[PDB]
Amino acid sequence: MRHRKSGRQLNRNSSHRQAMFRNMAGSLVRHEIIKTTLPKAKELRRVVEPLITLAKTDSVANRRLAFARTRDNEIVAKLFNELGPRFASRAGGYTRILKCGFRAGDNAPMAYIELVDR
Amino acid sequence: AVQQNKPTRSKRGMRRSHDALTAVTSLSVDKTSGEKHLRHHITADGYYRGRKVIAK
RNA sequence: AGGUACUCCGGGGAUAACAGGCUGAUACCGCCCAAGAGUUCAUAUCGACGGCGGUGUUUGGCACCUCGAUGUCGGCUCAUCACAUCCUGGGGCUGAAGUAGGUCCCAAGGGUAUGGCUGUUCGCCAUUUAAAGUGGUACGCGAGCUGGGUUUAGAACGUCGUGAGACAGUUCGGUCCCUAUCUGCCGUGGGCGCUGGAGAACUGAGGGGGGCUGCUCCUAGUACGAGAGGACCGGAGUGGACGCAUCACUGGUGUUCGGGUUGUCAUGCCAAUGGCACUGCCCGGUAGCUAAAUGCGGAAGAGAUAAGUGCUGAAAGCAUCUAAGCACGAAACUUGCCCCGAGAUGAGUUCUCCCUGACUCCUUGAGAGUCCUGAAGGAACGUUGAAGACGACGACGUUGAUAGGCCGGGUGUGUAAGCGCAGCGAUGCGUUGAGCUAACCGGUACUAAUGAACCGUGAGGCUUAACCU
RNA sequence: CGGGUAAGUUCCGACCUGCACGAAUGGCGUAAUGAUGGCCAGGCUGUCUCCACCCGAGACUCAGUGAAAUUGAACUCGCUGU
RNA sequence: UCAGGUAGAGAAUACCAAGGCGCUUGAGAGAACUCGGGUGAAGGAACUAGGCAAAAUGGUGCCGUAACUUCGGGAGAAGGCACGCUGAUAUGUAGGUGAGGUCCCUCGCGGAUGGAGCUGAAAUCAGUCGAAGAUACCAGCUGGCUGCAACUGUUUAUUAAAA
RNA sequence: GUCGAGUCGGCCUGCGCGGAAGAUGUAACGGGGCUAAACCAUGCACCGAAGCUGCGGCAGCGACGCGCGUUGUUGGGUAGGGGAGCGUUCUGUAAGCCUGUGAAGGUGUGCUGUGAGGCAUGCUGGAGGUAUCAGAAGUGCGAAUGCUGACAUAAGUAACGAUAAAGCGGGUGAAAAGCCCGCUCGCCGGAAGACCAAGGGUUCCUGUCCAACGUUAAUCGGGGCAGGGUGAGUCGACCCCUAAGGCGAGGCCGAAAGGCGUAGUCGAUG
RNA sequence: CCGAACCGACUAAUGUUGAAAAAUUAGCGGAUGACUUGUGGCUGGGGGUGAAAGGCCAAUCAAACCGGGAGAUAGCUGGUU
RNA sequence: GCGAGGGGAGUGAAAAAGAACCUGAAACCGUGUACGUACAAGCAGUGGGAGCACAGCUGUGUGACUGCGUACCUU
RNA sequence: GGUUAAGCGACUAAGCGUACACGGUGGAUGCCCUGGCAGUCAGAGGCGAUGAAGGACGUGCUAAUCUGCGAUAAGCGUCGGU
């Protein structure tokens, strides 16, 4: 049973999952749109959108939290200097997912995920 | 564990009576580009619900 | 003349060891006669000398099946049936005062120890229990587990043998394969049917589950008894074991939350952080799942009975529970309780909803075709769920709280960072119960749930009644 | 028979009724040693009472590739009998 | 054959360098059951042929250690205490290394003196943080009675390592 | 004593009653059911077999007459004995006969005999076939856990070879999870790094290709194809020298083959 | 003596159409010696070698492998159109 | 896909003689049509037999329902 | 005529079977012979230190293999045939 549980295992262990979404969150902030599998995209929302919410309040402590969660200073700078202000009046929902068919190699269901003002 | 008797071609067909594929019920038509596409998916040219969502 | 357990080939179920079969001497369980025991008294309880059966449970007989293989003792797991009943229920007799027993009859609903020793089954022992039943099921169960014992190859002792070797003597060591086609069984879907289609609510043929019991108290120190002791019947409470549900509490888990900390590498360095070391090692802990947690259950009642007890009553002027007639009588039976259930093809009922076009051809009929039409509803797709292997089932799709995010709260952790102060410094203190906080709660259209398209039709056979026209 | 245990067919100490020990196919002892045999205790624990939750890899679904033993023929149910 | 850094006794072990790799099916899901692991209330061998497996012990220094003995042993018997960091002693100590200078010489790759610089344990006293200082990885379970074989060795490659 | 017509218990005999408990499910008439649809006795009907009869046909044996007729009778069969045949390949008959106006073989259909079989013919095929009467046999297959090849089944099931691990952007391309480039992440580091001997032998580099090979895809490869690439007085071998050991002029020994060995000559791992 | 490399193989689980015709994982023994290892040499089948298990002698051992006597023989089993 | 493979064209007496090449059997696997089949229990046939389809009452195909019926070899 | 009732009732094929038609796979069958098998009649009964049998490596306008040949290398001289 998994009654009321949240989060996808994605056939990984916990440290792999955490590292993967740290990399993928960085790619989405950097490129503003990426293509990935539909389940990974849905999981990425719960990682990236709290980072943008954090970036709405610029302070030393918040930059350090964001650095702790991304480990990339170029990503932290873009979060606080660009994305935070771009989304300052939006109450959540900073990303959108667009389904785009099936991967050739393994028939995986694919999707684009982008920032909503891209 | 293994069969004691060779199953027949009739029984083989009966087992496969659930194997047939189902075609997509119907495709959707983009209101701007007129392309057909899987419902709730973008078109081959990058439209969704009438908006050019992605380049190429 | 011997050995082979270091072994080998050709054969046999022509022939043994296991299990089945036939048999039933033996075994076990009934019964008949009644010498006697029992103060008297054969029959409360035992029953000598002898007699007659039943079972298929023991030890055996046979050699019918299997030697081109039907794996063994015991344990473990899971059972299922019989009744010759261990407990609980009902009853007759007693050498039955009571309490407690003896013996026989009825009864198979449910229940029916944990340990020490040993490979043990068994048995003895310790301590429980209402009780620790007896048997059948390949001495149930190794394509379910074990492998201690038996029964390969190593080695030794006693013993036998000149010896190789041998011993249901002993001793230490010694490979347990199989992805399930069919039947069966547990679950879960797809198809078509049920006669126009569709959405619901049902009826209940039938099936399954459940059914155990202790102790204390009252009745009552009453009945009984010289005392010692000590009830039936009836009523109340509280447990054991078992079962179902649940998570409010008490807790476990909680690699998705917070913190402490060792070694090391990195982010230029300080400070702050991240990676790796079993989640590095640990301390706490949210939701969920859960037992050790805490709610509930077994019934009462009814019907028809078993053994048994009767009423009235002749046959047979009496007697007689029986022949006619009438009444009681148990955890067994049929119900009552819970769940499934109309594929119940004998395919049931009720409520509601939907469809009221045109034409042609033919072999002329429950016929075929074209045009127009496309309902109720369904499905699909999407967002999903304390629903789930997949199907299925439930919620929702902008006329929207379905999911994520966001906002507020709660909870958890336990006073972040930065700055300042004190201290030579480790560190302490202030800002500060701070910061962070998953699955929780209340809100909120920010994101994603698209207009469509698809399936499903167009008033529904014949015969005969009844009623109206 | 004694010891140990609530309880000990094993174990230890004895007895001698040695079925069938016995003196280099050695007898009786023996410190140390042993992945050697038996028995007891402290610690320790999911071995167990009696299992619960969690993390991973399979099992399950989708796409690609693609085996095996076996097989007289099958329209391959239960029971009681034969 | 070669053998870097930090910790370490170390060629153990952990994390890294140079350098080299992610192992030639993937994507989802988050049932039973199997495999490999983590934690567990109360109990603690009741399990079982048998504590099989698991859990546990585990470092250094010091204190301390029985029967028995072939006088070597037994013995790491057993059992116990201390352990991080900071400051002081001492702006870095004991010790190691050793320059200039100075002196001598049978004048050198020399002796003697001298000690700047560099390196650097261990201890004691005081303070200080945490539930925990051998904090991770790593790393003995211990004791009692007894059979057999003295001992280290050897053996049934592939079910027997033993007497 | 009352009461007023039967009563009592032996024998033999028909049918029934108790005695009577078993394991998956009624389960001891085959079932339904039966009070006769049970049992006894008597009788008359009917059903019932591949038995008997009727009708038609074939064969064996024996009679009787002229191979034929007539007649009687027989015809279940394993081991096994006896009798009579079908078809296949090859030799003669055959320098014949059939056949491009379509042979053999293949595949259908019709007819035919008691059978093995025979005949005809449509389609396919595209060059052989062969009467009759004789002759000879590698002369007939379902089995031998037979032999060889082909193809099934289980089944689109198990599995895809260490649980060190991936994510994304760009490129190329018909197509990219896997190739190339980039950033990030993770793993080894007394090795999963570097370099030799042995062993292998072109696997090396470049271009090109993706059938097969690669447990998937592949634009990639230790795969296909083509071209290129290995430079020594000093490194190694060869070489000088010997060890164990081998061979060994003569020699000694042995039926033969050969055995041993002296002088010698080989032999690195030195 | 403790313990890596190296040489072994006591226990358990897995695996048993394996990743493997003897392994993997966690533990385990020896580890200056009767040690271990490279290269080359020698011993040959009733023979070798054996700290001895009938062990080993090329995944083969109570008499190796290959070829031959050879179509051994088979009072047995199967099959026989 | 400057593929594989195929469709045309052409050669040839013939290309279902196209190099995976004469003939091209059987097992095995498909597409099309006719009839049967979702209340029915077993060597799957045989005897009886309705209905439907087809070709000319009959021939062919199918076979609801029903009596009977446990393969072959060996030993 | 309609309504109701009772009774009876075809058209479904997820798939499966039999028959037929047309295919796939596969390589039987027939037909075929520069290969074998058994002989008869003849020949020759050896080759080698003048270096054999059997090989290695070369050899072409040649990348490979077969056949031939040998640094004079699919060949050179001479005599005959054609």
Ligand SMILES: [K+]
């Ligand atoms: K003998």
Ligand SMILES: [K+]
């Ligand atoms: K023996």
Ligand SMILES: [K+]
């Ligand atoms: K009997």
Ligand SMILES: [K+]
């Ligand atoms: K009997």
Ligand SMILES: [K+]
């Ligand atoms: K009896």
Ligand SMILES: [K+]
């Ligand atoms: K047997």
Ligand SMILES: [K+]
């Ligand atoms: K039982």
Ligand SMILES: [K+]
């Ligand atoms: K009772």
Ligand SMILES: [K+]
């Ligand atoms: K009684």
Ligand SMILES: [K+]
């Ligand atoms: K009972």
Ligand SMILES: [K+]
């Ligand atoms: K025991």
Ligand SMILES: [K+]
């Ligand atoms: K016993």
Ligand SMILES: [K+]
């Ligand atoms: K048995």
Ligand SMILES: [K+]
């Ligand atoms: K077993």
Ligand SMILES: [K+]
């Ligand atoms: K057993």
Ligand SMILES: [K+]
């Ligand atoms: K079995």
